[model samples]
Target: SHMRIVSAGSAVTELILALGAEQQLVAVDVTSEVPSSLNLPTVGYHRRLAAEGLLTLEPTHLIGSDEMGPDTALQQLRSSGIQVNVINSDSTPQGLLTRIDQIAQITHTEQHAQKLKENVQQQINALQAKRPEKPKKVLFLLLHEGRAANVAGSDTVPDTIIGLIGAHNPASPSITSYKPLSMESMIEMQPDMVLVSGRSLEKLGGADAVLNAVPMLAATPAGQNKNIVAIDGHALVGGLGLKSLQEAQRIQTLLYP
Candidate 1:
């Protein structure tokens, strides 16, 4: 029998719905905003999960992101015999497919999972077919507190996503997920465009402020040509699933157009 389960993490919740197990999900993590048909209790964001909030749902099993589960709460749940499964946080296309396939097996929807996997591969293939002759030099930033900013590095999901859109991330040299961006560093890279995903126009202090925040950006090739574009973060860097494909297409259109 497909027993009742609770999930934490957007990717895990998305996989459940994709596998036709929405009915079995008693609760989900706070970031489970996709698959709009779901109306279950949420345990709040993945990192902030608490024992009371989760145990209240009365789920027979709990599936978490690779990084989910508070050691104490997890131990408590384990004492009660609740199952915990950690799904992979795959940053590449191949990793995503394998994780999806694994989720399908746990949920007993292997057939549907296979179809979703194939569909994603086909979509990625289509996107690859549209690559430009030369990849654009792109710089991704997470702007916070009016000036506190960090750049996406080689090992992050953003780096992998940028590759899908035929763009080269100049921040690749950092070799980490996200780190502070320095004016001196940006000047040296002189990326073609600056990508700001998720932050709103208001929060980013409008286009003028965004361009002006980093004085070096204006002096660089990107500002002279006006190639900066802000997009929804969830679409581009949240989870590498169907939404990621849409995000890739959106990014290509914005950077190319």
Candidate 2:
């Protein structure tokens, strides 16, 4: 029996909990939002893991997205007899469901995963049905101090969410993933709305500070209407998970309202 496991990546952790198999998790990576009471040990960020730290946990199995590693550390784990299962972290609703099933299969909890998948699918389907006839053009920005704002483009979680909601990303043509942009070019794009991670928004000192950082935004449609939306940073990481789906629904209401 796989009684011991180490889960990395937010989606992997959430799926473990969703499958009612948290007890098998000896530790989870830092990105997971485990309950305060769980007090499970952390293996640090999935991307910067150390082989020794995970080795000490003595887990029988390790599960995470393909994103989890610096490569050498993962190789060491495999050498040490730990079954490292890597799930694809695609930024789409179908990807999320596929991962849920994968985790459940690993944990031998097929029945639980099937039920959760149905619930998530139903919610996403209902959300998609409510998309506006004319979807809005949204620009998702990643704020960084002492640097030009980075924008989300094709192949990113933000872009995926926008696509799922029947909206378009104005920056898709010239950008892929997060790309730093000048204020002048950002205004030229003329997005109907702007989206920022809640953590980034807070770091920039709120909506007013965002305008100050990119003053040209004030002259654009989203800026003129103060239509900047803040989404949970955790939900935006490691592709679209259950929390991402929930956040997507909330953002849908905001978009149509």
Candidate 3:
């Protein structure tokens, strides 16, 4: 049993906790939102972990997504005879279930994984079944305070969520995950809804500031209807973890409501 573990990715951390194995986690990464009750130690940021710092915990195993590494740290962990599970980051509903099963197997909690899998499947199935009769064209806007606003496109978590909820991703055909397009091009895409993270919105000083930054947005159907949806930033992390699915449920309500 890899009972003493260090989780280095948000998805891995979430999965371990979901499987009722939080007690096994000696440390988690910065991206993980550890509960107050746990008081778990953190291994700094996932992408830039310090090998010596982790070594101090004496973790029996280290688990994280493929994104979790500076390479050297992971190599050191393995050389030190610690089990390291590097899982691929798949940002789809099936991907989430697969991760759950993988985590369960690693932790020897197959029963808990099965129950969680069932719950995830039921939620997704119900969401798919209730797709809107007339879908809306939605664009997920990635906004940084000083950077250009890029839209989420094909092969992205946002794209998957939009597609699953029976909405059109106008940016899908033009680019990959997150790319900035000309304002004229954005106007041409003519989305029916514009989705942004709450943190992103706060960065831009709320909806009015966003409208001011992109006047053309006011002309789009989304802008015309003022359908700017603010999402939770954490939900759109590495992959389609539990928070992502739960956010999808909330987004479906926003789309239909």
Q: Please provide, for model 3 over 1-257, each residue's C-alpha lDDT reduced to its tens digit, 9 standing for 90 to 100.
A: 64899988888888898899989999998888789888899888888989999999999888988877899998998999889898758767788888888899888899898789999989888888888778888888887777888888888888888887778898998888789867887888898878885455666666666777667899898887777777777677768878887877888888887
> Weakest 10 consecutive residues, lDDT, candidate 3?
197-206
Poorly placed runs, candidate 2 (over 4 Å): none
In model 1, residue pairs whose N, Cα or C atoms come closer than 3 Å (at least 3 residues apart or on different chains), thus clashing, are 198-233
Model 1, 96-171: lDDT tens per residue? 8877887888888888976888888888887888788888888888877755678988766777778888888888
lDDT values of the candidates?
0.75, 0.83, 0.83
Per-candidate alpha-carbon RMSD to the true structure: 2.2, 1.7, 1.5
lDDT of 2 by residue, 1-257 (tens): 85798988888888889999988989988888788888899999888888999999899888988888989999999999999999969877788889988999999899898789999889878878887778888888988777668998888888877766667788877888889867777878888778885554667676677777778888888888878888888788778888887777888788877
* Residue pairs with backbone atoms closer than 3 Å in model 2 (clashes): none
TM-score of each: 0.90, 0.93, 0.95
Off by over 4 Å in 3: 198-201
Ranking by lDDT: 2, 3, 1
lDDT of 2: 0.83
Candidate with maximal TM-score: 3
